[PDB]
Design an enzyme around this catalytic site. Structure first.
Site, PDB file in Angstrom:
ATOM      1  N   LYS A 170       2.354  -3.876   8.627  1.00 35.44           N
ATOM      2  CA  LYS A 170       3.444  -2.896   8.634  1.00 35.44           C
ATOM      3  C   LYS A 170       4.737  -3.545   9.091  1.00 35.44           C
ATOM      4  CE  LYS A 170       4.193   1.761  10.545  1.00 35.44           C
ATOM      5  NZ  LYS A 170       3.481   2.845  11.300  1.00 35.44           N
TER       6      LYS A 170
ATOM      7  N   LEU B 131       0.817  -1.214   0.000  1.00 31.63           N
ATOM      8  CA  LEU B 131       0.000   0.000   0.000  1.00 31.63           C
ATOM      9  C   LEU B 131       0.844   1.254   0.000  1.00 31.63           C
ATOM     10  CD1 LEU B 131      -2.865  -0.920   2.551  1.00 31.63           C
ATOM     11  CD2 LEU B 131      -2.850  -1.079   0.043  1.00 31.63           C
TER      12      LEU B 131
ATOM     13  N   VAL C 158       4.037  -0.976   4.296  1.00 34.01           N
ATOM     14  CA  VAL C 158       2.710  -1.404   4.735  1.00 34.01           C
ATOM     15  C   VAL C 158       1.989  -2.152   3.621  1.00 34.01           C
ATOM     16  CG1 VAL C 158       0.502  -0.601   5.712  1.00 34.01           C
ATOM     17  CG2 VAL C 158       2.614   0.579   6.280  1.00 34.01           C
TER      18      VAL C 158
ATOM     19  N   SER D  53       5.135   2.845   1.451  1.00 30.47           N
ATOM     20  CA  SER D  53       6.350   2.733   2.246  1.00 30.47           C
ATOM     21  C   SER D  53       6.966   4.115   2.455  1.00 30.47           C
ATOM     22  CB  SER D  53       7.351   1.765   1.596  1.00 30.47           C
ATOM     23  OG  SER D  53       7.952   2.311   0.429  1.00 30.47           O
ATOM     24  N   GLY D  54       7.789   4.240   3.493  1.00 32.81           N
ATOM     25  CA  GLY D  54       8.476   5.485   3.810  1.00 32.81           C
ATOM     26  C   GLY D  54       9.095   5.456   5.198  1.00 32.81           C
ATOM     27  N   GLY D  55       9.065   6.593   5.891  1.00 33.36           N
ATOM     28  CA  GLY D  55       9.619   6.684   7.234  1.00 33.36           C
ATOM     29  C   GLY D  55       8.932   5.748   8.222  1.00 33.36           C
TER      30      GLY D  55
ATOM     31  N   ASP E  57       2.780  13.867  15.564  1.00 35.86           N
ATOM     32  CA  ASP E  57       2.897  13.991  14.110  1.00 35.86           C
ATOM     33  C   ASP E  57       1.514  14.085  13.476  1.00 35.86           C
ATOM     34  OD1 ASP E  57       4.506  14.250  11.805  1.00 35.86           O
ATOM     35  OD2 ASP E  57       4.545  12.113  11.388  1.00 35.86           O
TER      36      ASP E  57
END
Length: 274
Positions: free
Chosen positions: A35, A12, A20, A14-16, A135
């Site tokens: 995740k 679905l 996922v 991805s990143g920091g 955040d």
């Protein structure tokens, strides 16, 4: 058990936050998000009541999971040699607030009020559970496109709620308060309210108000879209330069602009064509 309990589907994103995947619990076909987080890329660690080493994200998720589903809840987790796999709830159909705002631009105040209200209830629930998200932004908010219900995600920059000063921060800078920019110090609640001001401006104007440090410190909000005087007032109150001049959650929710809110299902029928 292992990984025979879940059928893996498309990635679905991805990143920091890690990577996922879309998944389905084989036991009862429930939609779930899988995740993956690499141990080497984790920084903030904690411990579970039972005395085990886990990422702070799991600690925080466990404290906010249960009844009032204003947060995507943690259903299970696993440890692998180089990673931690987290099993979370998944909504379908769904869209995050960032992509929603990208497609539709500035939201009508009626919709912004229902959404912001739900965000407020979700952040209160976190604080009640002793958790500070740190955040809050549109990328970390998911919309149930059928039910009009919003859910808060990604506790990877969060911390246990405390009444003393925070001197660390690893969330989004353009959502960070002036006291953090200038002094590298903030208190949890007032810093949260500032991020909520940035989020409300973002909903009603189609974009965030500040890009540069100089702009955050100066604290002057200019509006690019037509926005009611009561809505501008609430945003500027949340964005007060002195932390103690910002409203509490109760003051936000009793503000005149926040009255006569639509329930999620009504919100979806009118604005999500559901």
């Amino acid at each position: 058990p292992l990984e025979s309990q879940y059928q893996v589907g498309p990635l679905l994103g991805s990143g920091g936050f890690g990577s996922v995947y879309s998944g389905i619990r084989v036991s009862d076909n429930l939609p779930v998000a899988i995740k993956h987080v690499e141990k080497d890329r984790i920084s903030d660690w904690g411990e579970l009541p039972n005395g085990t080493r886990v990422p702070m994200e799991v600690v925080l998720l466990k404290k906010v999971s249960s009844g009032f589903s204003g947060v995507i809840r943690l259903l299970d987790w696993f440890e692998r040699p180089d990673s931690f796999v987290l099993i979370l709830e998944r909504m379908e159909p769904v869209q995050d607030l960032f992509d929603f705002i990208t497609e539709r631009g500035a939201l009508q105040e009626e919709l912004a009020r229902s959404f912001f209200w739900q965000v407020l209830e979700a952040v209160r629930h976190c604080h009640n559970c002793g958790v500070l998200h740190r955040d809050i932004k549109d990328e970390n908010i998911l919309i149930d496109l059928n039910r009009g219900e919003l859910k808060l995600i990604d506790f990877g920059s969060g911390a246990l709620l405390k009444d003393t000063v925070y001197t660390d921060f690893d969330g989004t800078r353009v959502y960070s308060p002036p006291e953090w920019i200038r002094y590298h110090r903030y208190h949890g609640r007032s810093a949260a309210v500032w991020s909520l001001g940035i989020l409300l401006y973002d909903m009603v104007c189609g974009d965030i108000p500040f890009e540069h440090d100089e702009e955050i410190i100066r604290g002057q909000v200019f509006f690019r879209q037509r926005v009611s005087s009561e809505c501008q007032h609430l945003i500027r109150w949340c964005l007060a330069l002195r932390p103690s001049d910002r409203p509490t959650f109760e003051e936000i929710q009793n503000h005149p602009w926040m009255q006569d809110v639509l329930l999620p299902q009504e919100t979806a029928e009118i604005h999500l064509h559901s």
